[PDB]
Design a protein around this nucleic acid. Structure first.
Lengths: 276, 274
DNA sequence: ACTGGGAATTTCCAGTGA
DNA sequence: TCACTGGAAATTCCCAGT
């Protein structure tokens, strides 16, 4: 048998909570979750239905998949991992109360010591390779299912990793959002100054991206024009056609080059320009 | 009796208090008339004496009674949170060019005060009874304590003199008010033009945009929701007091913190006819 | 008592003309 | 050169709702 993730955790929009905040850490939703239809991380065991247990732990985003210093917290969680029975009547299993508690950088050494001490090392990475820097803004769920073989002896299935879950404090992997803009039209010749307020970005990894059918262009600005990570002053690019006879609607959105993430699009109208 | 005169006060706004985690030294407090080209420092004049002696500089609370402050003075000739060095025999004017303010953490407050008492750092000899209540950790005064000599070499302690307050720039309610950028610096005299203003950190509950001219006063229109992450304000210009006008008129536009009535440097705004 | 989110408090870091 | 100078990040706190 083998494990399959049929509903991944939602990657973005969750804040990892510190122990000091004293509020567990909420519940990781499923990828296709909404207010109307709430869903949770779900696995399917293929080739087995019957008694079994599951451990869910946190490992690093990148290989080797070392145990992460952060902790899973919530019901049936101890020492930073979840452990409980699977229903023997079903092959599909969901997990409704998985929260992520982030450890402080000062307590990192201690946390890793606990991971080893509690035999929380799903990929059996050597301690020598567990030195080196951790990305404390990203984790993967690691599902470790133990079933029974036909003879009725405990059988540990191969561990399966989720997609990365990202702390929403980290701007490099956060959702891009335009909050406020002072101007949503301009000359087809470009060069109109626009003030844009956004959620926190990194000034060296941000673009303003204009698009239409078979057309793309970028706003003009320097790193100096990004104010405290939450405001961009830029100049509009020229439109493809400099001799517009009537307004043309295009999309404007934030773009993060590193992962090619996009904000929700926003309507911008290029206008005819008689003369300057 | 000789006495101490402060001929160059410290600059009140603009400088961060530094934590111990940031380093041993915490820069140097500039003088109020420092302008980078002309880089000045706090300086005192000792009227009616010149010769050997000592000068101690300590931090006291902004408001009376001037209790010793939990924060520490750090830098050259500093120890146990105060500056102490030999007075220059030759000159009667004395500059202090490496005074840094190291802020203690809120949880180490009781420890800090204990050190002040233990080191006899209490210029105004305030009873320990009064050293328990609330400290303003965002503001301090320098206290200049000069000891000179009589003709026989007896120490004579001159009256201690206080500086103007120095405010932590990293703290939200005592930071320097600064307009960094605006989308436009002119509009109609009828008002209602939308301004996007980028600024240094403000508190949305304690900020306004203050328009002023020769015998006129008005305020930018916005709600707390219009302050974006403490560093930007979207507001509507007020009407000028002349809806006709005819010819352009210039006015000042400033950030204002109502709590302490502080103002940013003024930015020029031009009202236009129609 | 458990969360969603803004900000206060404390820590870290890149560059800076030298 | 590297002790400063601001910008960014990490950690803690708090209010306002269920």
């Amino acid at each position: 048998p083998y494990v399959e993730i049929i509903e991944q955790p939602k990657q973005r929009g969750m804040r990892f909570r510190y122990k000091c905040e004293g509020r567990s850490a909420g519940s990781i939703p499923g990828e296709r979750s909404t207010d109307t239809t709430k869903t949770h991380p779900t696995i399917k065991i293929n080739g087995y239905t019957g008694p079994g247990t599951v451990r869910i732990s946190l490992v690093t985003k990148d290989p080797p998949h070392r145990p992460h210093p952060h902790e899973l917290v919530g019901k049936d969680c101890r020492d930073g991992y979840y452990e409980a029975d699977l229903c023997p009547d079903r092959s599909i299993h969901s997990f409704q109360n998985l929260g992520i508690q982030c450890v402080k950088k000062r307590d990192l050494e201690q946390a890793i010591s606990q991971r080893i001490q509690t035999n929380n090392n799903p990929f059996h990475v050597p301690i020598e390779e567990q030195r080196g820097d951790y990305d404390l803004n990203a984790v993967r769920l690691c599902f470790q299912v133990t079933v029974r073989d036909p003879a009725g002896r405990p059988l540990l299935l191969t561990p399966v990793l989720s997609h990365p879950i990202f702390d929403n404090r980290a701007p490099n992997t956060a959702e891009l959002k335009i909050c406020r803009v002072n101007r949503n039209s301009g000359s087809c010749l470009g060069g109109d100054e626009i003030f844009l307020l956004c959620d926190k970005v990194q000034k060296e990894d941000i673009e303003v991206y204009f698009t239409g059918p078979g057309w793309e262009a970028r706003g003009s600005f320097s790193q100096a024009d990004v104010h405290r990570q939450v405001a961009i002053v830029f100049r509009t690019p020229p439109y493809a056609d400099p001799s517009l006879q009537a307004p043309v609607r295009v999309s404007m959105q934030l773009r993060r080059p590193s992962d090619r993430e996009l904000s929700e699009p926003m309507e911008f109208q290029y206008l005819p320009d008689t003369d300057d």
